[PDB]
Design a protein around this ligand. Structure first.
Ligand SMILES: CS(=O)(=O)N1CCCc2ccccc21
Length: 284
């Protein structure tokens, strides 16, 4: 069923809470035993948000390989994403170790460091060119190269150096700075413009490791970003774009990380973004 008609029928019937609970009931339940080990308590922001064992990213070290991060591998769309929590004071070195080891070209940040008067993630990148950051626990150096501040987002060029080998790489930081503290954006226009800037950069392409995507827990806004991107790519690839079923794509992605899309308002927003983004790409 054309999702735009499904959309108007859910709106007219006011049945967004019922549709969202049906997704919650059908979602996969896989073990997360490594996340719950006592040694990993200060590596988790939220007790109820953990990576599954089967899809978790492993750090390349014998001491403790754990990070709160999941590989979302979308087979038909030929896209992969790493979804992760906002870094904690004791996991900023792990975060950049993961970017290095997975060969990522982009980091997508969908939160502010402070929201609702509380810290939602560590200040994990440098704010001034002449004040670089050294992560002694993972042997990395990170330097701010340039910053472009726009009304709805900021793009940063960063240099990450592996101090062990003196190899360097350019990382692109895409920071969506205007998601409201409560609810979802009224229009998906700035969020779609942002998604198109990340695509334009090469950060989502198969010549690179997977993009790293985060918010505070790495499931709500982060889930909206990957769900919208995958649904639009399938609408381009298939003979019948009207066959793309957003609820079935979301349940496929929930095989790889729990809790993607946190509210009925985030579900409605993801439908709006896909419907509006389909028109704009259609030369329309
Ligand atoms: C009353 S509702 O269940 O249909 N609902 C649930 C929460 C999200 C939403 C957004 C716009 C309009 C209705 C809703």
């Amino acid at each position: 069923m054309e999702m735009e008609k499904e959309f108007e029928q859910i709106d007219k019937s006011g049945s967004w809470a019922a549709i969202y609970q049906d997704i919650r009931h059908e979602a996969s339940d896989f073990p997360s035993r490594v996340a719950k080990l006592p040694k990993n308590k200060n590596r988790n922001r939220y007790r109820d948000v953990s990576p599954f064992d089967h899809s978790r990213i492993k750090l390349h070290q014998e001491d403790n390989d754990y990070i709160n991060a999941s590989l979302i591998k979308m087979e038909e769309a030929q896209r992969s994403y790493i979804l992760t929590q906002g870094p904690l004071p004791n996991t900023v070195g792990h975060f950049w170790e993961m970017v290095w080891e997975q060969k990522s070209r982009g980091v997508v940040m969908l939160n502010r460091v402070m929201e609702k008067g509380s810290l939602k993630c560590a200040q994990y990148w440098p704010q001034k060119e002449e004040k670089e950051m050294i992560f002694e626990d993972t042997n990395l150096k990170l330097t701010l190269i340039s910053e472009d501040i726009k009304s709805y987002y900021t793009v940063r060029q960063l240099e990450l150096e592996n101090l062990t080998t003196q190899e360097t790489r350019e990382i692109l930081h895409f920071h969506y700075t205007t998601w409201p503290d409560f609810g979802v954006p009224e229009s998906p226009a700035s969020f779609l413009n942002f998604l198109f800037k990340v695509r334009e950069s090469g950060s989502l392409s198969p010549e690179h490791g997977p993009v790293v995507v985060h918010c505070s827990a790495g499931i709500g806004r982060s889930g909206t970003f990957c769900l919208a991107d995958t649904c639009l790519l399938l609408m381009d690839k298939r003979k019948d774009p009207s066959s793309v079923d957003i609820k079935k794509v979301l349940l496929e992605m929930r095989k790889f990380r729990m809790g993607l899309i946190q509210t009925a308002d985030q579900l409605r927003f993801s439908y709006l973004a896909v419907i509006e983004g389909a028109k704009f790409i259609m030369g329309d």
